[model samples]
Target: TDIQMTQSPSSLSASVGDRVTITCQASQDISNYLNWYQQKPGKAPKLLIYDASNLETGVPSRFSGSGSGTDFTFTISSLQPEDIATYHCQQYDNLPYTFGQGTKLEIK
Candidate 1:
């Protein structure tokens, strides 16, 4: 299991529709049980995945991910007003869950 990520520091500003790539490292494969989450300016983290490609019941389709084995990417194709915050990746295929550090999106 791994909970590491690589993202730009500070200058992570983005406009409404800019695409962002937040990468993470996995010591082992977590399969398709990865999840993406968004934490608004003043809100708790939200779940965006459970069974790999399966999106949560009320989550928008803008948040998505793809990759199996040990490589994966969590992407927000288009940014929304409510999407202003930090994004994280987690693997639920094992016992102890792990999450990517976080990628903070800025207004541009």
Candidate 2:
């Protein structure tokens, strides 16, 4: 599977309780093999959503994912201090998974 994502808004500034969105357009249909991740400056990336829209165990309810095939979105219903990090979308439908170029979130 050839999957490439067009991620945008390389960075964003928001406040607590504010909603934020990150989008990616893949080059091919990947079904639900997409995953979302959150990475802090000094920490490894944490899986937020998997299989397109399923939230990982223990992940905050405020975070969510949507879309299918070649288009996907990662969203935060309410921004939190701890949410200040980089978000990435990865496609695992094909071997040698591909990842988006990360969206950075910051406090406004």
Candidate 3:
């Protein structure tokens, strides 16, 4: 049997400059083998965070990740217009590599 990934709240609405947070969970402890991505409409997904909290190359410092084990958190320091998009969290510690339900963000 393989592990599973779960994310909370399918969508979110936030004000500009507000901190955006997304939660992810694994069926079992996966340590820090988590990754975060951002995808804009009509564009491809961009790696924003990896290895639980390491900022991905070329990604803005405002984008960060936290947590370990079965619980993980994806953070956007200050939300912006361009940040209104889809965010996805995934686990790669196991060969199954499961992905969470993509979170959609919109400026409210």
What would the per-residue lDDT of candidate 2 be over residues 1-108, giving only the tens digit for each residue? 356777877999999999999998888888888899999878889999999899888999998899988888888998989889999889898977889988999999
Estimate TM-scores for all models.
Answer: 0.79, 0.94, 0.94
lDDT agreement of model 2 with the native: 0.88
The better-scoring model by TM-score among 1 and 2 is 2
Clashing pairs in 3: none
**Per-residue lDDT of candidate 3, residues 1-35 (tens digit):** 68888898799899999999899999999999998
Q: List the candidate 3 regions with Cα displacement exceeding 4 Å.
A: none
**Per-residue lDDT over 1-102 for candidate 1, one digit per residue giving the tens place of the 0 to 100 score:** 244433233237778888766665566766676777778766778887655566888888787777776777767788777777887778777767877677
- Please list the residue runs of candidate 1 whose C-alpha ends up more than 4 Å from where it truly belongs after superposition: 1-11
After superposing candidate 2 on the true structure, give the runs of residues whose Cα lies further than 4 Å from its correct spot: none
Q: Scored by Cα lDDT, where does model 1 land?
A: 0.70
